[PDB]
Ligand binder design. Structure first.
Ligand SMILES: CO[C@@H]1O[C@@H]2CO[C@](C)(C(=O)O)O[C@H]2[C@H](O[C@@H]2O[C@H](CO)[C@@H](O[C@@H]3O[C@@H]4CO[C@](C)(C(=O)O)O[C@H]4[C@H](O)[C@@H]3NC(C)=O)[C@H](O)[C@H]2NC(C)=O)[C@@H]1NC(C)=O
Length: 170
């Protein structure tokens, strides 16, 4: 048995999770930006950062945005595509939701989204969330449309790491 705090400490020592911005603290009750979670995914699945490329037209998405190399990496990997393919908006300052997190992890772990899933997720995420719940990445009782707490994300990331180790191709 490991606590959420212990799982954070482990992932932090591994360079996967950082403290809540402005702190080095777990702050398990707080939310996380899509920018921060992009970095988490890059560190968790050992993706290569992509510098000098910008695939999004978000305000202040440029060379001066620390998150750009991570957002570009998850985009190239096919984990995240942003919220609007017309306007090319990632929403890097937006909070990562349980169902958004579910998609990234289900895609990274190569799990099959469940066809004709019945749950409270947004239509696009129904299969991704169902697959995430079935794999034990999130609880059945998690709100897919809710901002994921750092606790939920720590538990999800740790579970995804264990699944990667166990698969034979970490
Ligand atoms: C900017 O305002 C818009 O207004 C729209 C009005 O019409 C509808 C149909 C509506 O709901 O009535 O859609 C509104 C827009 O909602 C968004 O519609 C987008 C296009 O389908 C949805 O995009 C998803 O965004 C995920 C992001 O995170 C990841 C992990 C990612 O790839 O970055 O997954 C992504 C999935 O693939 C999806 N991506 C794509 C490209 O379809 C967003 O999840 C969805 N937001 C919500 C709260 O439901 C949106 N409103 C809001 C509150 O965001």
């Amino acid at each position: 048995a490991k606590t959420t705090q212990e799982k954070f400490d482990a992932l932090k020592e591994a360079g996967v999770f950082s403290g809540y911005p402005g702190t080095t603290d777990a702050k398990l009750g707080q939310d996380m930006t899509r920018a921060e979670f992009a970095k988490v995914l890059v560190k968790l699945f050992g993706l290569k950062e992509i510098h000098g490329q910008y695939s999004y037209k978000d305000k202040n998405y440029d060379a001066k945005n620390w998150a750009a190399p991570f957002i570009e990496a998850v985009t190239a990997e096919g984990l995240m595509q942003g919220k609007d393919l017309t306007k090319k908006i990632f929403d890097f300052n937006g909070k990562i939701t349980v169902e958004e997190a579910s998609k990234t992890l289900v895609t990274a772990l190569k799990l099959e989204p469940v066809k004709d899933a019945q749950n409270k997720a947004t239509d696009w995420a129904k299969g991704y969330f169902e697959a995430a719940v079935n794999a034990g990445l999130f609880s059945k009782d998690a709100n897919p449309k809710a901002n994921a707490t750092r606790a939920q994300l720590v538990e999800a990331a740790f579970a995804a790491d264990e699944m990667s180790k166990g698969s034979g191709s970490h």
